[PDB]
Amino acid sequence: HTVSPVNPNAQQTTKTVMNWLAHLPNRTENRVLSGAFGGYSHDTFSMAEADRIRSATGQSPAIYGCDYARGWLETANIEDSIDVSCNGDLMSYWKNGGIPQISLHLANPAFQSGHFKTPITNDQYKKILDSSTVEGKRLNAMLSKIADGLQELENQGVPVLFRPLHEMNGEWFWWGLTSYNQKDNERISLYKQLYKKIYHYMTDTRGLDHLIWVYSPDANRDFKTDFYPGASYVDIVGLDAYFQDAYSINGYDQLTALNKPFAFTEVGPQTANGSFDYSLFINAIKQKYPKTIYFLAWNDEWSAAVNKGASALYHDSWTLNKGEIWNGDSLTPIVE
Known part of the structure; x- marks a missing residue:
């Protein structure tokens, strides 16, 4: 069975990686990619997190994350919250045998800038969806700058795990629910x-x-x-x-x-x-969540490097680390 990206015009490398990822749970080992968050672009992003994991374990995370959007910042233009300077490191990570991941702590376009964790009403949310409002234009200004950054990676054929609008069932980000575990059909x-x-x-x-x-x-x-x-x-x-x-x-x-x-x-x-x-x-992955294809541990105090069991995590027979996607000029096996 082939698993193809949802985008019908996906680049060949992206198609290959997607099919390869989807088949990992059929393996007997090397079936869960390791991952680490590297930080927020031009703020905390660096290679330090990857390097600390390597110093602690001898291995590097297969996936390295960056977040373009510093949505807490009060800025002259809402899109100033977006920075894409981490791109070079993400492209290099792919070149050197890992895969980049991008998330977005988007500023809140119901406001002039910032306010990423300020909740909004459904009426405000509707305005954001409408490209003709000030709210919609603010959203599109952010998206345009994000896309300019993503294009840089596409120009080198680098597949990206793109994870927008996360934790939407939580009540903290502006794009999510507004009250703790409160179903709101319109918000959904x-x-x-x-x-x-x-x-x-x-x-x-x-x-x-x-x-x-x-x-x-x-x-x-x-x-x-x-x-x-x-x-x-x-x-x-x-x-x-x-x-x-x-x-x-x-x-x-x-x-x-x-x-x-x-x-x-x-x-x-x-x-x-x-x-x-x-x-x-x-161990819980092996016993409880075997279809897991990757994990992405956060940085700072959440980091694998500073928490117990880092070596066991990175050396487990199931864990696939940087350099274990490709075997030189060949792809590691796709098992059916």
Whole structure:
């Protein structure tokens, strides 16, 4: 069975990587890509996180993340919150045997700038969806700058795990729910519209053919599947999971049931307690979440490098690290 990107015009390299990723759970080893968040572009992004993991374990994460959007900033123009200077490092990461991932802590276009965690009403959200309003124009200004950055990677044929509008079932980001675990049918509909608006802007308006689209609800809130925009807009489903108990993460059954590859799209300790153990997380994957194709641990205090079990995580027979995607000029096996 071949798994093809949802974008019908995806570049060959992106098609190959998507099919390869989807088949990882058929392997007996090297079946879960490691990953780490590298930081926010021109703010905290650097190679330090990758280098610390390598110093701690001898291995580097297969996936390296950057976030273009510093959505807390109050800026003259809303799009000033976007910075794409991490691109060079992302392209180099691909060249050197890993895969880049981009997320977006978008500023809130209901406001002049910033306000990324300020909740908005459905009436405000409707304005954001309408390209003719000041709110819609602010959204499109951000999307345009993001797309300019993404184009740089496309020009070198670099596939990107693109994970927009994450944790939408949470109540913290402007694009999500407004109250804790409170179903709002209109908000769910509007979210799907917003995700599709970004999909169409990137794919059709901007012709971006190197993107693999990731849908990532939070594990610690309800409604993991209600926000799913549909099979034609999503390549990979996953959970952002911050926890103490690796074995009690909710949502894996619901998301794998959508018949898309599944990942732990963010992971880390819920609290800095000295109790968190990444060796237990990989064990939980083997026992509880075997269809997992990758994890992306956050940086700073959430980092694999500074938490217990880093070596066991990175050396587990299941873990696939930087340099293990390609075997020189050949691709490592696609198992059916």
